[PDB]
């Protein structure tokens, strides 16, 4: 905050909703709770200039959980390869998968 009145007065006006790994009703966890926790703890206290370099592994995993860009790339490759072989009759789906 520009003026950190919340910290001075010790009153929580809007921090409770800033991150998804904060306390939730009925302890419902967000899908990426573990990744966000690990990134936040890695980067805590060291400042953003250092964090952009020293917590890159945590942030990359957190970003993968959020948007699943690399998971979808790997699924698309398998599906693309699979339909190629089914066209050429060099592969047959098993009984399950059908």
Partner 1 sequence: MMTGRQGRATFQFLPDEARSLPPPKLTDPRLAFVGFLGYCSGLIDNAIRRRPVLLAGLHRQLLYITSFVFVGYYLLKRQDYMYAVRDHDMFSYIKSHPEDFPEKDKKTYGEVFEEFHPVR
Partner 2 sequence: PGIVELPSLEDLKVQEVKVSSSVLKAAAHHYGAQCDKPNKEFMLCRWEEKDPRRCLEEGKLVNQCALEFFRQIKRHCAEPFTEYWTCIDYSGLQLFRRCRKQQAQFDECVLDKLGWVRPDLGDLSKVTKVKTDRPLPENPYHSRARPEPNPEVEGDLKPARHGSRLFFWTM
Partner 3 sequence: MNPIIFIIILLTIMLGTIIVMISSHWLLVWIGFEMNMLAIIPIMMKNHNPRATEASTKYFLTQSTASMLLMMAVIINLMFSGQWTVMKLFNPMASMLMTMALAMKLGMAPFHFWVPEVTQGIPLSSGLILLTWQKLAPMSVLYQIFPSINLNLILTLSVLSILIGGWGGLNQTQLRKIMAYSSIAHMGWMTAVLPYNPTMTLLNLIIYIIMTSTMFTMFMANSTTTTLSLSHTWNKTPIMTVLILATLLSMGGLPPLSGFMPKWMIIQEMTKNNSIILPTFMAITALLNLYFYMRLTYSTTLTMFPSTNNMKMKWQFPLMKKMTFLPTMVVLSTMMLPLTPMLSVLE
Ligand X SMILES: CCCCCCCCCCCCCCCCCC(=O)OC[C@H](COP(=O)([O-])OCC[N+](C)(C)C)OC(=O)CCCCCCCCCCCCCCCCC
Reported as half-sphere exposure (CB side, CA atoms, 13 A), residue 46 has a value of 13
Kindly tell me which of 6 and 71 has the beta carbon lying closer to partner 3.
6
What residues from 31 to 50 belong to the interface with partner 2 (CB under 8 A)?
34, 37-38, 41-43, 45-47, 50
Reported as half-sphere exposure (CB side, CA atoms, 13 A), residue 8 has a value of 5
Contact between 14 and ligand X by CB under 6 A: the answer reads no
Site string for partner 3, 75-94 (x = CB under 8 A): --------------------
CA–CA dist 35, 58 (Å, integer): 7
CA–CA dist 2, 5 (Å, integer): 9
Sites of contact with partner 3 (CB under 8 A): 1-6, 13-15, 17-20, 30, 32, 36, 48, 62-63, 66-67
């Amino acid at each position: 905050p520009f003026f950190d009145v919340q910290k001075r007065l010790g009153v929580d006006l809007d921090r409770w909703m800033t991150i998804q790994s904060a306390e939730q009703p009925h302890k419902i966890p967000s899908r990426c709770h573990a990744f966000e926790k690990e990134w936040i703890e890695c980067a805590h206290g060291i400042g953003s200039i250092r964090a952009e370099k020293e917590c890159k592994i945590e942030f990359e995993d957190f970003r993968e959980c959020l948007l699943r860009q690399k998971t979808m790339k790997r699924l698309h490759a398998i599906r693309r390869q699979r339909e190629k072989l089914i066209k050429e009759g060099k592969y047959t789906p098993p009984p399950h998968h059908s």
